[model samples]
Target: DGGQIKGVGSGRCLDVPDASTSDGTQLQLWDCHSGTNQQWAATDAGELRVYGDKCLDAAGTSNGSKVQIYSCWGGDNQKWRLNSDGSVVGVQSGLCLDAVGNGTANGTLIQLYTCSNGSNQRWTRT
Candidate 1:
């Protein structure tokens, strides 16, 4: 299903700011709405895609590395696996996609962090 990726901790949706097409724009958490920017698809190739061509990408290979939407090119950094516990793990870095500071407010920055099974690191495709 291509739908909102909801933050389990915050009860918000993974969002692309202004539905931007500009590459490397960091993702954030926003109120769930019926917008294309909030819709994402998990593909067979191991990508979480938004805006059709942009894939969720790890900006770096370490903790605190930011996650952004970039042109999908099948890079290791663009691959993600949804774990049974709801943590979205980066295929290359093995880091959990996290909402920074466990924030529940709108515009909470999303980043990569060590997996802890915390609600801030959990997501649900809805």
Candidate 2:
């Protein structure tokens, strides 16, 4: 329901690094690709670590958040809990990974937001 590739919010994909930043800049998603960037890991503790360290982080945990890559600090924003139903919940607030609403193809950022049970926020393990 939540983590399915075809789920409501699951269809959205965006390119990471804006295609301008050089390699090693993490790639975001926009409804395409099975590349390593599109893959994820659900830790035994339930933290959804994107591409291992690449994470859906809020800008210093601020509101109107912007998702960007930072060193994996094992911080709250970097931790997640995969639900039994495939929905991965942020361990700190039970939030979900969200594709910026009305986002376009390039430069669309991602963020961690309160789970609305929407597909734009749901993702699957590749």
Candidate 3:
């Protein structure tokens, strides 16, 4: 639907803080309000993009890496795969996009973690 990328456990959307388009802006789990900041679309190139320009990016090639919105550059770190099981996997690190600590509150930071199919690592495109 090219709408919100929502957390399965938190029931929140992956959001750009302050709706900022600045590179390196960390994404967080916030209440799904159908705002532009919550909208996401995946490109055929494997980039999960928001704000028309920023890509969901894995900060590093390891578990626990931060997930942020960075300028789309077709980098491996910017590639992602949305699994049928509701998990979003980072192509670069093979880690799952996770809600830090299974946090359900607003402002819960997103990160990359070892894929365990946990609810915290599950996402659904609305």
Candidate 4:
């Protein structure tokens, strides 16, 4: 289902700043303005796509991998699991989508880390 991914802690919506189409764009949280960049589509394959086709992805395999926008290719890094606990995990490394620094700021970057019960890892697929 394509919608928006909202953060439970930050009280903000997932956004691609300026709606930039570039790879490696830092996905952040912004005021819920209903912007197109805030839209997300969780695919059957577990991909979180935004701006229509760009895949929400982790940049590398290491722990604390940086999350960014990448062109969708069905790769392991592009695959995400929207878990029942509201933690979105990357299939490749089993890392959960995390709000960097447990930040509630508008520009806090999304990253990957071992899953925990931390509220910063909780997200709504909206």
In terms of lDDT, which candidate is strongest? 1
State the weakest 10-residue window (summed lDDT) of model 4.
27-36
Order the candidate numbers by lDDT, best to worst.
1, 3, 4, 2
Which portions of model 3 miss their true places by more than 4 Å?
Answer: none
**Model 1 alpha-carbon drift over 4 Å, by segment:** none
Kindly list the per-residue Cα lDDT of model 4 for residues 21-96, writing each as its tens digit. 9999978878777777888888888889987889998998776688999899989999988888889888998898
Best by TM-score: 1
Candidate 3: tens digits of C-alpha lDDT, residues 76-112: 9999987899988888899999888878899999998
**By the TM-score metric, which is better: model 1 or model 4?**
1
RMSD of each: 0.8, 4.8, 1.1, 1.2
Please list the C-alpha lDDT of all candidates, in the order they appear.
0.93, 0.51, 0.87, 0.85
Off-target runs (Cα >4 Å) in candidate 2 are: 1-7, 13-15, 18-27, 50-56, 102-107
TM-score against native, each model: 0.97, 0.62, 0.96, 0.94
Cα displacement (angstroms), candidate 2, residue 56, comes to 4.2
- How good is model 2 by TM-score? 0.62
Q: Give the 10-residue window scoring lowest on summed lDDT in candidate 3.
A: 1-10
- Pick by lDDT: 1 or 4, better one: 1
Q: What is the lDDT of residue 9 in candidate 2?
A: 46
| lDDT-superior candidate, 1 or 3 | 1
Instruction: Between candidates 2 and 4, name the one with more favorable TM-score.
Output: 4
